[PDB]
Write a protein that binds this ligand. Structure first.
Ligand code: MG
Ligand code: MG
Ligand code: MG
Ligand code: MG
Ligand code: MG
Ligand code: MG
Ligand code: MG
Ligand code: MG
Ligand code: MG
Ligand code: MG
Ligand code: MG
Ligand code: MG
Ligand code: MG
Ligand code: MG
Ligand code: MG
Ligand code: MG
Ligand code: MG
Ligand code: MG
Ligand code: MG
Ligand code: MG
Ligand code: MG
Ligand code: MG
Ligand code: MG
Ligand code: MG
Ligand code: MG
Ligand code: MG
Ligand code: MG
Ligand code: MG
Ligand code: MG
Ligand code: MG
Ligand code: MG
Ligand code: MG
Ligand code: MG
Ligand code: MG
Ligand code: MG
Ligand code: MG
Ligand code: MG
Ligand code: MG
Ligand code: MG
Ligand code: MG
Ligand code: MG
Ligand code: MG
Ligand code: MG
Ligand code: MG
Ligand code: ZN
Lengths: 69, 154, 90, 50, 114
RNA sequence: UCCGUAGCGGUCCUGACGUGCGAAUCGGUCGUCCGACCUGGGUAUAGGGGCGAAAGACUAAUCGAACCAUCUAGUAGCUGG
RNA sequence: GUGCAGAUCUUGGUGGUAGUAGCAAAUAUUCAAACGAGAACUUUGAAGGCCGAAGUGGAGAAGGGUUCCAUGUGAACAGCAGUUGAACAUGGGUCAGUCGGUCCUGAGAGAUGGGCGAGCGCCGUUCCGAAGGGACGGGCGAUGGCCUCCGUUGCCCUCAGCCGAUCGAAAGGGAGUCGGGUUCAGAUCCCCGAAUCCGGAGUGGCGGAGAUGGGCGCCGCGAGGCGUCCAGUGCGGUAACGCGACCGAUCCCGGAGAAGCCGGCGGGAGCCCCGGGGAGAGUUCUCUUUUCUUUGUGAAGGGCAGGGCGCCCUGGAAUGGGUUCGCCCCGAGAGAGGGGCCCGUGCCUUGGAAAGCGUCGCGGUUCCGGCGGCGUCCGGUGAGCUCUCGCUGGCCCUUGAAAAUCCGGGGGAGAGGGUGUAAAUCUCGCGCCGGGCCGUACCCAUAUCCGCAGCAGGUCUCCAAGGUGAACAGCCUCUGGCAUGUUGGAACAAUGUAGGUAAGGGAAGUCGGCAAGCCGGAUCCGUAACUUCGGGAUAAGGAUUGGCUCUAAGGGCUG
RNA sequence: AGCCGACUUAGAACUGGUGCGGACCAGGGGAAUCCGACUGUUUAAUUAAAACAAAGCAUCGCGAAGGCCCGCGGCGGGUGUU
């Protein structure tokens, strides 16, 4: 597993060709965005509920989204 | 299985770009970083092999050759040495005193490293117990627990 | 075990191992040495004693003069008092 | 042992397959003398060599 | 207290059959078979008893994986010889080469008068 | 080096057993237990040979010359029919 | 091959003994119910017990070979019986790039050359040998495709060491897989989720590095822009060394693999311990804010503690200091400051709460990795036990393996581009494909192995709780396991076997104190002759030991 | 001055029908003689010993085409990587 510190590199890893899926985990005091690539599961950790919702619209349209529960 | 220590001496090959490794028997007083010289024109110091026809009479040697070129056969146990008695410039013969006291006439062209063998006085310390003799001969050969022939059967 | 805290059930009778087997003199010595050398060091960086009295008392501690922390503290105070007349009369 | 070789396991496989009783229909045959399987083997009694 | 068993068929406590304890997400204690401890390279001088610095101590076939900067020090004889015996060999190589020039000069100084 | 456990061994009761749990075991009591220690696996030495801290001990329940086959239906002034 | 009464005759069969010896080593069974024709022995529940962490527990190696699992049977076997079984009869069951074999060498085994030998053959392993079928650069020749530029093989020039073919370890060496779930029986192998190792690539898939800098002459107010002349196989730190790469062959040097036994100390885990919060149980006749169970996070990556350094810089120390448990260190540079490196199995984070577990409750009437509500918390300690890491010391007339394989360095033959759609090159980040063959079930031992057997014998290892206690001693208990070791009932005679106890005497017994008995731990004193001065020695000899209530002494943290 | 914690040692009082290492664990001792120094080993299945070994002591051979020994035989082999 790899942790992406920034938001800008998360968009490139989601826009990779080998990004099989993206999944959103909604727990307390944290929002987790996980992109399943060929080698690693890249995780973006957001502790801002406003930026989580705008990024959720800001995902690329060609990627398959699985909102976890 | 040997009371004498060995010295690993490194030379360089005169014909190929290689470093050559040899195991000499260490003369007493030899330390590391010391340069060991070999040949007819080498000077006379401890740990310095040269033919016996060059050194003067009374020289104390070890690792003496009984035949020219057989890489050392005589006086090479710990604390032992040989003494050069006399030369003979005609017919190239040299008389040496072997560590058993018997004098041998060798050729004048065979080599011996100058000095006594290190680790002398080894038989001075008494083996106090059978265990040290067991550990001594376990490193050499299965010969130690010697049963007397009178204790056997005919 | 709450009575062994008070000291009960540990007399001469209910005692099967030797004194060294129950409380080894080596670990007693090591705790005393670490305590006394800690005290001497803390008295040295606090400038209560200097390098010469620290080196003199280190060897006395190692040579078993002071039995605990308190008798070392009294001896340091006695030496400070005896140095405080030598540096007062000169 | 569990650390078998291929030839030993194949030999054990054959000796497992020969350890079944005779089929019921063979002694309705005309020229028949077999009553049962006399070449049978039990793992506790006969230890198969090896 | 949960007593635990080996996870492989080697039941002897050999040098390769070395384990450590690990706590698991299923709340149980397992064996994890450890790797042997690596050693840093020894200096090529042959006199320094310490091992070299700046090089990771791994098993020899792990050095295939590692990049070059994890395997050497950016210096002449770096990752193979210690800096003390590098500078003590620089001084030696300079000084004996200087003394050879002195001997060459003193040879011609004798041949000039004689 | 001493007491002593696991381990290794086997003093005494000449105990138990002795058509036995057992073609050599069991109980108590014992010797040793950091070293000439104990032990698995691999490997070497083969029969007038090996190997033996030596008892003619061990060498697959077989040892003052193992085991298998053959010479062999060996011979017997001796025993039994 | 012709007549049996014998030959401890041969083979086969059958008696008395005789319903006799016997089914007696390791404390133990009892009540109720179910199935059934049938229950001392099967199954379930309730007891009472034992094995008591060096186990009658949980897993393996060797060996066994289906004994493993499900169902049916009760003919034969399981020395009583059986509704039961490791028996019989039907069917099932072992899934791997990462776990091992496979590869390497060890002691050693073993061809060829050679030698010996009547001969099968034997010796011998580098010894009486023309023992290399390889590679880079060049020249020559052909082939096939953007016949561009590489690749291919044929010949020549050049260069080349090895040490002996081959075999030899399921415990030595040896890259790389862990978490959850799943079966009637298989799981580091199946499923899900996370990784990781090796090999492959013309077009090399992409990005990044190599690297895009300066001078001069013009122009543009400048911001900057065209044209020439060059450089550019990276960069930083005094240093230890660091940064994501950071060309280079034949050759050479070195390292790792690759090292004994023991003692002491320190660090980190796991287990145990104490004080509280939850959740669920147990007692409650009286008391007990009580007693019991449980209360977490993988591999791999990143960061930070912690541990170690025989690493570096300043500076020069006697009134010698620093320092350990012991040691030990220092003008060949100590203390004191400031750095650097290695291991980080510990903590945090990604994994990762989604999964797991506890508890409560709803569904599917059930065939469900079903859906939910909460919780999975805060601390303190230790000459504790085990494992591991590290430091330091002792011992040896004992010095405690090799090779496969991998890496670093020194050299500088060469290669690449003329200022750019820059080139050769890359151990940097991703992206693509593949990993073939064999073993894998179970027992592993008072019933799956060897002893003719379910034989008190033998047979190599891993884990190792609470109390008492010096203790892995003995005894009791918890987790787990079992039914008393090839049978039960009733009696309690002798003689046995295994245990004890005995007035008064105390070896009178006996070959002989045989056997049994006395003594025993710890604390305090005390301790002879003799001696090889080390011992003898726990010499001998006495005194004390329970419970309860106290007192004194022995330490860290903060200012 | 405050806050914390681990096991020990010594002493005193009281107290039980003198019992207290209450089970378990757990050396009988002394004076001498003979032999073997000791630790070790040995007749697996009648003898564990005073037997064997052992260090120490003392002789013997051998300077390598050699001493001792193996081998049917070889420019064979072990000691001898001496
Ligand atoms: Mg021996
Ligand atoms: Mg005899
Ligand atoms: Mg002491
Ligand atoms: Mg059997
Ligand atoms: Mg292995
Ligand atoms: Mg963890
Ligand atoms: Mg580096
Ligand atoms: Mg001893
Ligand atoms: Mg003893
Ligand atoms: Mg008897
Ligand atoms: Mg009888
Ligand atoms: Mg029996
Ligand atoms: Mg022979
Ligand atoms: Mg023997
Ligand atoms: Mg005899
Ligand atoms: Mg006659
Ligand atoms: Mg006829
Ligand atoms: Mg008849
Ligand atoms: Mg009867
Ligand atoms: Mg099991
Ligand atoms: Mg078991
Ligand atoms: Mg029966
Ligand atoms: Mg079964
Ligand atoms: Mg897989
Ligand atoms: Mg051969
Ligand atoms: Mg092989
Ligand atoms: Mg192997
Ligand atoms: Mg310093
Ligand atoms: Mg949950
Ligand atoms: Mg270079
Ligand atoms: Mg299995
Ligand atoms: Mg049985
Ligand atoms: Mg019974
Ligand atoms: Mg019974
Ligand atoms: Mg009486
Ligand atoms: Mg009486
Ligand atoms: Mg009498
Ligand atoms: Mg009488
Ligand atoms: Mg007696
Ligand atoms: Mg005495
Ligand atoms: Mg006398
Ligand atoms: Mg004796
Ligand atoms: Mg006997
Ligand atoms: Mg006996
Ligand atoms: Zn160096």
């Amino acid at each position: 597993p790899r942790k992406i510190e920034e938001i800008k590199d998360f968009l490139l890893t989601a826009r990779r060709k080998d990004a099989k899926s993206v999944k959103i985990k909604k727990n307390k005091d944290n929002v987790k965005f996980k992109v399943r690539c060929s080698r690693y599961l890249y995780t973006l950790v957001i502790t801002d509920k406003e930026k989580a919702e705008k990024l959720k619209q800001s995902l690329p349209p060609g990627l398959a989204v699985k909102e976890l529960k | 299985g040997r009371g004498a220590p060995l010295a690993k001496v490194v030379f360089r090959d005169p014909y190929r770009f290689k470093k050559r490794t040899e195991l000499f028997i260490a003369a007493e007083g030899i330390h590391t970083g010391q340069f060991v010289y070999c040949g007819k024109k080498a000077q006379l110091n401890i740990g310095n092999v040269l033919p016996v026809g060059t050194m003067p009479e009374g020289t104390i040697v070890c690792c003496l050759e009984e035949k020219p070129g057989d890489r050392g056969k005589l006086a090479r146990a710990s604390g032992n040495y040989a003494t050069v008695i006399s030369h003979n410039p005609e017919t190239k013969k040299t008389r040496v005193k072997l560590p058993s006291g018997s004098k041998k006439v060798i050729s004048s062209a065979n080599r011996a490293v100058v000095g006594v063998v290190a680790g002398g006085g080894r038989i001075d310390k008494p083996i106090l117990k059978a265990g040290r003799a067991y550990h001594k001969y376990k490193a050499k050969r299965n010969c130690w627990p010697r049963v007397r022939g009178v204790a056997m059967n005919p | 075990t709450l009575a062994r805290r008070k000291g009960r059930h540990m007399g001469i009778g209910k005692r099967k191992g030797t004194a060294n087997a129950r409380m080894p003199e080596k670990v007693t010595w090591m705790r005393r040495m670490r305590i006394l050398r800690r005290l001497l060091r803390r008295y040295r960086e606090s400038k209560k004693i200097d390098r010469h009295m620290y080196h003199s008392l280190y060897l006395k501690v190692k040579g078993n003069v002071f039995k605990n922390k308190r008798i070392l503290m009294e001896h340091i105070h006695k030496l400070k008092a005896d140095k405080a007349r030598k540096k007062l009369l000169a | 042992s569990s650390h078998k070789t291929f030839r030993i396991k194949r030999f054990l496989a054959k000796k497992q397959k020969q350890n079944r009783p005779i089929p019921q229909w063979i002694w309705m045959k005309t020229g028949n003398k077999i009553r049962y399987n006399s070449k049978r083997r039990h793992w506790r009694r006969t230890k198969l060599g090896l | 207290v949960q007593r635990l068993t080996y996870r492989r068929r080697l039941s002897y406590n050999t040098a390769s059959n070395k384990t450590r304890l690990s706590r698991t997400p299923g709340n149980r204690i397992v064996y994890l078979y450890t790797k042997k401890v690596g050693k840093a390279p020894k200096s090529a001088c042959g006199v320094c008893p310490g091992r070299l610095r700046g090089v990771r101590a791994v098993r020899p076939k792990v050095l295939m994986r590692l990049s070059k900067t994890k395997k050497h020090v950016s210096r002449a004889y770096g990752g193979s010889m210690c800096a003390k015996c590098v500078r003590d060999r620089i001084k030696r190589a300079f000084l004996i080469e200087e003394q050879k020039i002195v001997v060459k000069v003193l040879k011609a100084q004798a041949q000039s008068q004689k």
